[PDB]
Write a protein that binds this ligand. Structure first.
Ligand SMILES: [Ca+2]
Ligand SMILES: [Ca+2]
Ligand SMILES: [Ca+2]
Ligand SMILES: [Ca+2]
Lengths: 308, 308, 308, 308
């Protein structure tokens, strides 16, 4: 039940730190014949790297994709330590590659005729290492489509979103790289809420993978709706990256200058997004600000049907 | 036509850098028998201090209040230089006091039986100097009700509001002072929009002072509505401080920890507002987030009628 | 036994946080008819402000100078808290002025025909407040002769000297002020060592004040010679300011650009001294780097004889 | 005339940005049967990476070592741009490996039974990338012996030495890595001066390689003795790393905590060296503070004789 990519599919590399949001992202990416996932690499944020790698293997096992090249990446942020303080996935059916993660990225990028899109959904540690170590491959990277950041209001500190906060230095390197970026930050993901009726649509999709996703969403309904945020349904974060790859017209986007703060007393990890063109600086990212929520749900339902 | 404060009025000191927003603030403050303005002191942000002092004198002349103690304050921010790059007020009918501005503040605060509310509407330079120099008077300061800051999105840099940006060090000292604060930032002032029909109500008030305010608003309609902000009407900033003094129930408020960033690469002048209680830090300000816009207009109309 | 200043004496204001180094400084300043001390103001660093003020009163009592205007200054640094963690002076014979310290400074500076030299020997908190609050008096300040800083190697943190570290913001304001500065930092004070034979010369001076100084030096010999510093004798810090006022030819000096670091992770409170002209920035201080140690001792002995 | 390492030699990797100091370092390293150079990798600081790689090839050609694995490294610092603004070496006789530089480092480190010493003499960019990307190899790195830093007084900015200043982020990562470090900073290299008579000793060594070194030193005598530094002879910087590997007893060393400043206004690139144990922090580097200069010259003369 592996989905075969079209020859004309967008080649991508998925760099992720799964828990559960990432899991849904991987499930959506691997459901689409419009995408060609060349490899999965793992990052670490608030779980040990052994755990995120194991979780990636469990997700790939769920999807019967033991053929997917997978490698564990950096064990900690570039210049800081990890910040360590649900429903069950199947036990892994296979072992990961022992190959170094950015070596694996370079191999796939070098070998791909078509420039590759990097899709990180955790801290940007591995992406930064790749950018800094393989300058000759930048022309073979189409874009970096990342989940991270917030154009003003953080969810980890008042100024910073979690993925960026974990490794501000890595994020800084990404935004300075000159490679095209699409930033899917909290501004859009806060709007990507799943309602009860949306979960029931997903649960009605007649395959095991949809059942897994619906269970994850049930869990999010209970534990990802702290009333202080004022959510009606549970937001989905990481899957917004895949939705943008598949149907970018779902999104309100603007080309902006974005800087990552690495020096402030209170603001380390902030993405400073010049939405109102106050700085005069050249835009370095496509920043997503809103989405067609119903269209997003429709896309998820359509995607998961591929596993029927 | 001077408005006589009630014996039970709230004593205040108005510290301001007028241009035109401040002018409306002073006009509203001096219209109310519920407030007792003890002095006016001037700060400087994007005009020379000679100009802001002259403008304060012109406003007080408009209001026939040459009795008001007025003194020019600091000529520049504490640790930075000024950032220097409309309709007409009457020429001044009187000279300012030569007394030092924070000496004048201390005199009035020391002499007031009732603790005094400081009401800054420009950079916080003079307020910080007062706080640091007169620790023995902190118990005689009720509150600092300031226009400044933004809980995430600036209007001068992407992270910072103008008044705070001009003098982040001064602002930092204010927020660290332990004196109660009400912060009227861009979050609320962006909502305090004046519509065409609101201006026409004000213009219909049968006195010269209302005519002046309506002319200022006409000007704001043309030049303070850069379409990028997406305003329907022209926002009023500084007058929100006076509205909070007179009718705080117009506002949505929350007790928050607020820190001022003075060290970041991209974020100097940001007010970091912990609206979602992520830091565990004790609240040091009442932050205003929304207001009853129609109620705000009604208050302005009622206030200006005092000059009939 | 008060020393009467010459009409042609250098007017000075002594701003200090005594413990014992400051005490010797005040004793030397008040011994010289070449200096005219207009007032003493107190700062606070690692003792409560009540203690430094009391100590100033005790020193002035020792010297039979209850006529000296004295006032306690700021109770804490501008943007930080105090860092709180010997032989006995006489009990105070008089009370301090209740006048605000920078108001007292302004009064004396305004009243002095001759521009006044400010001589701080503790954190620069009061000096910064004066500079920022009284811009119109800058032309009546000759120079600021301060004990503080180090051109590379701190004694409190690896990068910072104590006085600057206590209040980096205040120090920053001083060095940005445009008022001439002489910086007597650790580079020179480390060389200003008092040997056993020097103490015995001082002790032989036939008056009570010299006896007090010799006792202070005995104490320094025991407790101010941590072997890690590699001192042969006990350094005298604050008195180097007075020695520079009286006999500047004792010193090796160079005009340098100096910046105070207020933003770094590890370097807050550092004085960045461009001794090797690497920055291209205009010099803002006379920095002292070495002294004629024997000449310094000779000056002290000559000074203390004035109390005979 | 290749020098064959002893089986018991110290394995090293030389990471360098040659101009001329590095050249002398490579010449000394490759002269010693006590060292086993596994590879040469190039960094870039104030010359384009094509130039430093070419220069490394020219040095290896001089030494008849076309067998040495050599690879060009990062083309720019991690989070900053390069800072771009003598006698002749032979034209290269061979091409470099096309292999990625940190992949080459990992290959040699993984293959070496004996833990390897990394010896950087330029910006620490490649070393940081290796540390962050290959955590599993840290136990196979004996030590990092680097030329860089200064315990208080910089040669590029007042606070920072050049190699660290070029890439403070990389340096920060090195000092945080937990791998043993020997820091050969300006404190020691300033003392490593070559006198006229020392050059003439070297020139008398009867082989072409010594003649080359003497010519480089002649050049240094003219252009590396800006009188502001107060040098008597021309300092040698990078070769101090090799001297420490061969004869560490030439040096005065102390175990210190060292932090790299990446956030300050004036102090970015500073190495903050806690020589006086003020911070309580655990030591992370052996810092060199002085050397036996004559012994250093004697070592150089003895080394260059290996090419006879
Ligand atoms: Ca994730
Ligand atoms: Ca204003
Ligand atoms: Ca002192
Ligand atoms: Ca070098």
């Amino acid at each position: 039940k592996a989905i075969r990519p079209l020859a004309s599919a967008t080649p991508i590399i998925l760099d992720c730190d799964p828990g559960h949001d990432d899991a849904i992202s991987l499930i959506l990416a691997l459901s689409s014949e419009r995408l060609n996932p060349l490899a999965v690499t793992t990052s670490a944020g608030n779980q040990t790297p052994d755990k995120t790698l194991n979780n990636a293997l469990r997700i790939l096992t769920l999807l019967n994709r033991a053929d997917m090249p997978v490698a564990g990446g950096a064990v900690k942020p570039l210049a800081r330590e990890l910040i360590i303080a649900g429903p069950k996935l199947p036990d892994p059916s296979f072992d990961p590659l022992t190959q170094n993660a950015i070596e694996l990225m370079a191999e796939k990028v070098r070998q791909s005729a078509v420039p590759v899109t990097l899709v990180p959904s955790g801290p940007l540690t591995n992406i930064a290492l790749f950018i800094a170590n393989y300058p000759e491959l930048h022309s073979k990277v189409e874009r970096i489509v990342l989940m991270g950041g917030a154009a003003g209001v953080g969810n980890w500190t008042p100024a910073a979103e979690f993925n960026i906060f974990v490794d501000p230095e890595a994020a800084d390197m990404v935004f300075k790289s000159g490679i095209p970026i699409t930033m899917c930050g909290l501004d859009v993901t806060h709007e990507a809420q799943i309602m009860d009726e949306d979960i029931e649509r997903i649960r009605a999709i007649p395959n095991p993978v949809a059942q897994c996703v619906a269970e994850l969403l049930d869990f999010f309904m209970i534990y990802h709706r702290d009333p202080k945020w004022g959510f009606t349904g549970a937001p989905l974060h990481d899957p917004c990256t895949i939705a943008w790859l598949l149907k970018p017209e779902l999104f309100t986007a603007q080309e902006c200058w974005v800087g990552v703060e690495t020096k402030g007393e209170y603001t380390q990890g902030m993405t400073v997004v010049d939405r109102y063109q106050l700085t005069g600086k050249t835009a370095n990212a496509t920043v997503l600000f809103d989405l067609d929520r119903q269209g997003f749900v429709d896309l998820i339902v359509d995607c998961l049907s591929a596993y029927n």
